[PDB]
Amino acid sequence: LPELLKLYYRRLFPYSQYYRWLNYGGVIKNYFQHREFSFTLKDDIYIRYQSFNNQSDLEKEMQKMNPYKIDIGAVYSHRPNQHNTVKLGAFQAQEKELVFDIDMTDYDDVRRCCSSADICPKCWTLMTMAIRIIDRALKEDFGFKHRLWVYSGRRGVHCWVCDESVRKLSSAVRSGIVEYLSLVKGGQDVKKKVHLSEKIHPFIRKSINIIKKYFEEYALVNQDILENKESWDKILALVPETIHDELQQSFQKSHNSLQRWEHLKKVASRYQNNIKNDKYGPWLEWEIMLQYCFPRLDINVSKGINHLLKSPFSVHPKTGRISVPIDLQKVDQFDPFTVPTTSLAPYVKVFEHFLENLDKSRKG
């Protein structure tokens, strides 16, 4: 791995674009010098609180250490590489991009073709829906303009939202943003994770609209979510016990997940129309669809201003893949198995398009 990283950090890493990104035109005094970075090296040796006076310092350090993994931190009250010179308690984080972290391993209770840190073309449709739902929310509902989506290198993607107002958000509002973006509740042992009110806020409506474009191909065809009793038991844990007998009988009489899901919707519709006073909510179909397709997140990644998350155009040590950006005009056409390990130019072009929008917004 180190020789490939030496060549990569010499010839292929986009330093000018990276410095242009995190310096934000130099409008704010010593902003890039106050930016934190963190390096992970051979045998997982570790160096936190890196920071660089200019693009040359960044280039020199990344070529010197040749890190396996790089993480980006906050803008601090002082230069992080000089934090040993600062008074007690005076070294503090001040600003940070609103960062989201989405991994395929988080879906192991609903995906069936793969598990753990491995992925395949069947389950990566979840990441297409996840990117689209989160990005659409950030675009339309939150109104944030500059949103950089990046593949982690193996098992997921990261979103870096880079507006100035976004960079100045507080921990409480960051947590509120995640909570609003988190219909899927609870830990690994919680059986039912999505619950909906009798009448629904328009934010949720759009998620079902996106999911419908992929739910057949993903859930009913590739995952086959109602293939057998073991698979449909997990869905029956989401529904009233009064209709478990009827649903089991209908599933047994039905040949495949397509017919079984149609029967589930029919039974759910009849139960919804028949009984008002039950503890289960009426939008049962939407709850099942959302639990099997909606985005999933770690609130600790986003809430902490001083948190460290993986750098764009860093590398993965076992796959060898570069942490490339994802084109929002062509999300469905991205493929993690085609990622480079020159052919890197389209991803740098996505980064440069994002930065041209950023610069034009700053100037206009």
Partner: protein, 241 residues
């Protein structure tokens, strides 16, 4: 035919936000009793709370009797209520220093102030809302009100709490989802493309929040800057007991 022929400016409304220092004089017994009667009021708000549920008509009916008995500002009167308003203003400035002696005491009196403010905002007639929102910095401009009936259909279909009548009598105007923060993060009500179809009470919550922020900054200033004024402090023990 056309014919030919001062304290109004101080408080055009009973509502006040303590921006201007009253640059005048006071008596010893005057500032003493102006503050002490309000200490009794602070306790009385929570005594009424332990009596029965917050903000009901029983609360409302008893509370105004407290104000008439205690001679401080009211639901806004057209005669010389400016004297109660300046008494309220002056005595508010005097009250900053007593229960700054502990953060728990600060929070205690802040909480009864929020309850009192919520009551006053609950009392408001329409003309008060119309003139105070324009005369204050609390502008919060409305946009494209004719669309409200499309949201009379959509909100009603989309909300458990709201109803078609609330669209008009809790008169709806367009401001962002973030001004209805608890409503978006709880996903309680119809908001769309980041915008909220908002009645006055959300702006009341914002008023209370910025009031708390400004008052907390003032309490920090009270803790720090005050020692030049502290030539006399004999009331402070009797106030904290």
């Amino acid at each position: 035919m056309e014919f030919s022929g001062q304290r109004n400016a101080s408080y055009p409304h009973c509502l006040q936000f303590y921006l201007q220092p009253p640059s005048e004089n006071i008596s010893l017994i005057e500032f003493e009793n102006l503050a002490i009667d309000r200490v009794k009021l602070l306790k009385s708000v929570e005594n009424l709370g332990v009596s029965y549920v917050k903000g009901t008509e029983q609360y409302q009916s008893k509370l105004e009797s407290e104000l008439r008995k205690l001679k401080f500002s009211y639901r806004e009167n057209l005669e010389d209520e400016y004297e109660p308003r300046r008494r309220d203003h002056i005595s508010h400035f005097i009250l900053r220093l007593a229960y700054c002696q502990s953060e728990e005491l600060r929070r205690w009196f802040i909480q009864q102030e929020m309850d009192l403010l919520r009551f006053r905002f609950s009392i408001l007639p329409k003309d008060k809302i119309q003139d105070f929102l324009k005369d204050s910095q609390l502008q919060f401009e409305a946009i494209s009100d004719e669309e409200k009936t499309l949201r009379e259909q959509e909100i009603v279909a989309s909300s458990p709490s709201l109803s078609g009548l609330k669209l008009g009598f809790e008169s709806i105007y367009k401001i962002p989802f973030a001004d209805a923060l608890d409503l978006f993060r709880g996903r309680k009500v119809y908001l769309e493309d980041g915008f909220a179809y908002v009645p006055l009470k959300d702006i009341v919550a914002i008023i209370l929040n910025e009031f708390r922020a400004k008052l907390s900054k003032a309490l920090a200033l009270t803790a720090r800057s005050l020692p030049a004024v502290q030539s006399d402090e004999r009331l402070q023990p009797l106030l904290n007991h």
